[PDB]
Amino acid sequence: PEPVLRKVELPVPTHRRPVQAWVESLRGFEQERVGLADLHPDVFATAPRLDILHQVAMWQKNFKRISYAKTKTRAEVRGGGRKPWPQKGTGRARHGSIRSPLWRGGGVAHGPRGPTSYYYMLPMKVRALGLKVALTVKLAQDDLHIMDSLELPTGDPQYLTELAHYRRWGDSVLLVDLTHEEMPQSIVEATSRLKTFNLIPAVGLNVHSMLKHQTLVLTLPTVAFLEDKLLWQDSRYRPLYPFSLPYSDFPR
Amino acid sequence: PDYPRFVESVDEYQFVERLLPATRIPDPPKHEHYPTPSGWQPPRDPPPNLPYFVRRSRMHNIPVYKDITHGNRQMTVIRKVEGDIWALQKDVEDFLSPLLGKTPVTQVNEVTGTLRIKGYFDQELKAWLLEKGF
Amino acid sequence: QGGGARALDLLRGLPRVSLANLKPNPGSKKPERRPRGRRRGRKCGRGHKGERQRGTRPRLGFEGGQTPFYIRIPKYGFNEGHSFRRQYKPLSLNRLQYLIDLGRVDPSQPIDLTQLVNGRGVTIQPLKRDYGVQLVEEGADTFTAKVNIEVQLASELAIAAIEKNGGVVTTAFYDPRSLDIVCKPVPFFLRGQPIPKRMLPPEELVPYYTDAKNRGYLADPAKFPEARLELARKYGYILPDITKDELFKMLCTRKDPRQIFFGLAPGWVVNMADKKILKPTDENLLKYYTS
Amino acid sequence: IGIRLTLPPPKVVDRWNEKRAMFGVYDNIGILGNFEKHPKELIRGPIWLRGWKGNELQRCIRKRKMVGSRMFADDLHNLNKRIRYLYKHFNRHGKFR
Amino acid sequence: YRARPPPRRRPGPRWPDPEDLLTPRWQLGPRYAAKQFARYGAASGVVPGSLWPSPEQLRELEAEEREWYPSLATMQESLRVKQLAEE
Amino acid sequence: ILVCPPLRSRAYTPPEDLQSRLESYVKEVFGSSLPSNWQDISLEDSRLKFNLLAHLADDLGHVVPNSRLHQMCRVRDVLDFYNVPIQDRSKFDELSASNLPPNLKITWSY
Amino acid sequence: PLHKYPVWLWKRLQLREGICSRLPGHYLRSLEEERTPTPVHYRPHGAKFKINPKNGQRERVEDVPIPIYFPPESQRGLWGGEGWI
Ligand SMILES: [Mg+2]
Ligand SMILES: [Mg+2]
Ligand SMILES: [Mg+2]
Ligand SMILES: [Mg+2]
Ligand SMILES: [Mg+2]
Ligand SMILES: [Mg+2]
Ligand SMILES: [Mg+2]
Ligand SMILES: [Mg+2]
Ligand SMILES: [Mg+2]
Ligand SMILES: [Mg+2]
Incomplete structure (x- = not known):
């Protein structure tokens, strides 16, 4: 009776038309098709770059890894400053210490020397393009669902599981809200007791979480938030200084 | 601490906002005649x-x-x-062939959406793509 | 059209993209080579004995005992005093016209080094002994714009090209400390320090900026009309009368020799958090920032 | 000899615990958060390794100049020896010059 | 589950205890206070009058500038003498 | 108390009178002003596309997936979409559905 | 592991507890101060900047004091700050 239509706020290239998506509701088992949503083609319909997804996915796994494994070299093993037997005459092999790698209980020739950092930063546009490809892959595979709000009729976690099974979403569903302080209490109590249904803010969106979860759920404010954030990378000056400092027209 | 007195004003702040650089690249202004003296179209x-x-x-x-x-x-x-x-x-091959006298050696990268051509045809292809209106 | 649609509808029939079925782009990751096996084992790519296999190779440049090549050459002052020479990023009129046509540099306002950095037209590195930009004569034939630009150095031809179209070009000096402030005012405004007055050019650079032929900012304005006429006659163009122009006030807009920006006297403190400017009232402070 | 005669206990792995289900979250804190925070600031660990990477010689040099005054006497002595050894190895030994 | 609250840049000036020996010496000087005022404005609580040099520091600042940075007339006169010497 | 409805099957068979039924919904949404070239009607307006597709979903029990919405430029594309049958049978039943030879036996221990 | 405080801070940490913390306040100031002694065995530069003759540039100059060893016998007399070099 009252359709919910969302338009694209940012300008759209003339050679591409926006892609549509069904707007659904979480207030009932059969409250789907609340309206149509316009999605910017550059975000939800870009090229399917599987190789770009891999390097963004591998970046998140490895960049924050700190390996603490470390062994003791022959200089750090206690003792072993004394030559065991004279160089010649004993008729045995010649050794200079009892803590050499050849000796039992000695040091390691080439072992780990932790703590080690694997930190590296992909270019900002590469990381932002990884999100667009991640969003495009989900929509192209009918795993992305647009919502208007995350308000459930009840805070029962069993209600959420039955709602997702009826619509055949999948074993794991990732729920995204615009902010963390504006999340409705109905969905917070329903997801906090679930293991495969996760609730994250818009800023906590990442490729690894999206690929791990079979189904992705977005709200209307989240879609507008993503397009504003992601399309800003496509047409922007090279940074004179980090954007955390004041600019003429940032933040939007 | 006897600090010197000061005066706080806002009317002179208009000369500060003009020093702030912009993040978004401005859209080119409309010109009466094209192409521009720099050659942009x-x-x-x-x-x-x-x-x-x-x-x-x-x-x-x-x-x-x-x-x-x-x-x-x-x-x-x-x-x-x-x-x-x-x-x-095919269009590039049919356009560069008279210039070279032979079929150009080209590589097509579908995934990245890039066309790579052996030899320098920078100024030749830039003028050619402006004719088609890209 | 055809390519874009074919690349996504084909993805629909494929299984779900997950962390399992991912792989790197082919040719983007060379396999690691390790000293194992018959091919890469045994001497492991080191040869037969000697310093090569034992990892005791001599230093780079050592020639086995004879006098090294980089030593037997005589010393000449090619790079002597390299860190005290002044560098100027060239600014071509082709580049300047390219920025104007795209709106990145507005010709309706006076153009200084701040506006060029704002439009990403030039990249100034004060830490790399840069002292500003030099206006070069490349592309002077196709330049057609009336601008009020200020550049640290300018060639004789580039000055003539701008003044032919009715513009004004001036040369001003910036010290290395002031140059970093001009290029990135925002990082300086977050240091909580009052705006300093730029220092006068060194004794060697004084003749350049006190001569009207170079359009110096410390030159006598009475000699500017004489110099502008000589360039008009030499290169064969009629010198325009900018007094009759409507932008005469904008073109004549020039900053004080001790001033960094327009309308911002030295000693002021920019408070961007409250959008306020603090002006000292101390008699001793005012004498320091006005002398 | 050298091979066990009994199967090891089964390795039950919970793929949906708190840490795995929330791994990678906020890794886009800068791009999606007006660049107020940096993704390298999310990194936890040694204070000489947060948002930095280098080889073993650089890690030892960086560790010595940041937490060297807090290291134990035996640990600091070992670090100085390691830097002395690594300096000689990298700058005097190898296949390439 | 539910994700933890997002890491936010903790607002407000950070004033460490000057009596703590683990406080770096660069967080207790006037420069640190000056940078806080520029970033946060009046919310920093720093008296704006402290940003300008003190009368004792102003005399030192003038003394250095006078010795190393001469006036325009001083440089113009020096050039004239040198030019006559060369001629 | 909210009770979940039983799970809906994905099997879909195009009705023989689909074109007549679809034409009825077209006149409801776009009016009776234009009764010619009804398959060429453009779905640019969001209200018109939403009304047409929601009515079909509630009627035929088969909704258009989000990967197909952008392709529905005209009502002609909408008709072709609903002419494609959908099978929800499992692989074991599909294999047994085929005329298995007497020497071929399939077991499903799942 | 690591110490909570740097090793060079332990001397001033022992003045925070024990009988040292009960010492008069004015006395504690006299120890924690590190006033530079008057130069004796070296000539101070006198200025903060000098012009290096080779390149003719204004470079910063600092006075680095020369370590002085005071024998135990110097504590029973008045050497004027002098000592063995
Ligand atoms: Mg030993
Ligand atoms: Mg020994
Ligand atoms: Mg030995
Ligand atoms: Mg051991
Ligand atoms: Mg290249
Ligand atoms: Mg061989
Ligand atoms: Mg071999
Ligand atoms: Mg062998
Ligand atoms: Mg040999
Ligand atoms: Mg080496």
């Missing part, structure tokens, strides 16, 4: 009805660049190609 509206499409860079220029490897391998790269890139290869 805006894309044609409506876009041409071709099986492929080459969009401008974020600086509003034709995405044709020269590439060189090993110090002797001269290449020309056509980037940001959407649609049927294979139709673009």
Whole structure:
């Protein structure tokens, strides 16, 4: 009776038309098709770059890894400053210490020397393009669902599981809200007791979480938030200084 | 601590806001005559009805660049190609063949949407793509 | 059109993209080579004995005992005093016209080094002994714009090209400390320090900026009309009368020799958090920032 | 000899615990958060390794100049020896010059 | 589950205890206070009058400038003498 | 208390009178002003596309997936979409559904 | 592991507890101060900047004091700050 239509706020290239998506509701088992949503083609319909997804996915796994494994070299093993037997005459092999790698209980020739950092930063546009490809892959595979709000009729976690099974979403569903302080209490109590249904803010969106979860759920404010954030990378000056400092027209 | 007195004013802050750089690249202003003295030309509206499409860079220029490897391998790269890139290869081949006297050696990268051509054809392809209105 | 749609509808029939079925782009990751096996084992790519296999190779440049090549050459002052020479990023009129036509540099306002950095037209590195930009004569034939630009150095031809179209070009000096402030005012405004007055050019650079032929900012304005006429006659163009122009006030807008920006006297403190400017009232402070 | 005669206990792995289900979250804190925070600031660990990477010689040099005054006497002595050894190895030994 | 609250840049000036020996010496000087005022404005609580040099520091600042940075007339007169010497 | 409805099957068979039924919904949404070239009607307006597709979903029990919405430029594309049958049978039943030879036996221990 | 405080801070940490913390406040100031002694065995530069003759540039100059060893016998007399070099 009252359709919910969302338009694209940012300008759209003339050679591409926006892609549509069904707007659904979480207030009932059969409250789907609340309206149509316009999605910017550059975000939800870009090229399917599987190789770009891999390097963004591998970046998140490895960049924050700190390996603490470390062994003791022959200089750090206690003792072993004394030559065991004279160089010649004993008729045995010649050794200079009892803590050499050849000796039992000695040091390691080439072992780990932790703590080690694997930190590296992909270019900002590469990381932002990884999100667009991640969003495009989900929509192209009918795993992305647009919502208007995350308000459930009840805070029962069993209600959420039955709602997702009826619509055949999948074993794991990732729920995204615009902010963390504006999340409705109905969905917070329903997801906090679930293991495969996760609730994250818009800023906590990442490729690894999206690929791990079979189904992705977005709200209307989240879609507008993503397009504003992601399309800003496509047409922007090279940074004179980090954007955390004041600019003429940032933040939007 | 006997600090000197000061006066706080806001009328002079208008000269500070003009020193702030912008993050977004401004859209080029409309000009009475085209092309501009620098040679820049805006894309044609409506876009041409071709099986492929080459969009401008974020600086509003034709995405044709020269590439060189090993110090002797001269290449020309056509980037940001959407649609049927294979139709673009045929058009490029039929356009560069008279200039070279032979079929150009080209590489088509479907995943990245780039066309790579052996030899320098930067200024030749930039003028050629402006004719089609890209 | 055809390519874009074919690349996504084909993805629909494929299984779900997950962390399992991912792989790197082919040719983007060379396999690691390790000293194992018959091919890469045994001497492991080191040869037969000697310093090569034992990892005791001599230093780079050592020639086995004879006098090294980089030593037997005589010393000449090619790079002597390289860190005290002044560098100027060239600014071609082709580049300047390219920025104007795209709106990145507005010709309706006076153009200084701040506006060029704002439009990403030039990249100034004060830490790399840069002292500003030099206006070069490349592309002077196709330049057609009336601008009020200020550049640290300018060639004789580039000055003539701008003044032919009715513009004004002036040369001003910036010290390395002031140069970093001009290029990135925002990082300086977050240091909580009052705006300093730029220092006068060194004794060697004084003649350049006190001569009207170079359009110096410390030159006698009475000699500017004489110099502008000589360039008009030499290169064969009629010198325009900018007094009759409507932008005469904008073109004549020039900053004080001790001033960094327009309308911002030295000693002021920019408070961007409250959008306020603090002006000292101390008699001793005012004498320091006005002398 | 050298091979066990009994199967090891099964390795039950919970793929949906708190840490795995929330791994990678906020890795886009800068791009999606007006660049107020940096993704490298999310990194936890040694104070000489947060948002930095280098080889073993650089890690030892960086560790010595940041937490060297807090290291134990035996640990600091070992670090100085390691830097002395690594300096000689990298700058005097190898296949390439 | 539910994700933890997002890491936010903790607002407000950070004033460490000057009596703590683990406080770096660069967080207790006037320069640190000056940078806080520029970033946060009046919310920093720093008296704006402290940003300008003190009368004792102003005399030192003038003394250095006078010795090393001469006036325009001083440089113009020096050039004239040198030019006559060369001629 | 909210009770979940039983799970809906994905099997879909195009009705023989689909074109007549679809034409009825077209006149409801776009009016009776234009009764010619009804398959060429453009779905640019969001209200018109939403009304047409929601009515079909509630009627035929088969909704258009989000990967197909952008392709529905005209009502002609909408008709072709609903002419494609959908099978929800499992692989074991599909294999047994085929005329298995007497020497071929399939076991499903799942 | 690591110490909570740097090793060079332990001397001033022992003045925070024990009988040292109960010492008069004015006395504790006299120890924690590190006033530089008057130069004796070296000539101070006198200025903060000098012009290096080779390149003719204004470079910063600092006075680095020369370590002085005071024998135990110097504590029973008045050497004027002098000592063995
Ligand atoms: Mg030992
Ligand atoms: Mg010994
Ligand atoms: Mg030995
Ligand atoms: Mg051991
Ligand atoms: Mg290249
Ligand atoms: Mg062989
Ligand atoms: Mg071999
Ligand atoms: Mg062997
Ligand atoms: Mg040999
Ligand atoms: Mg080496």
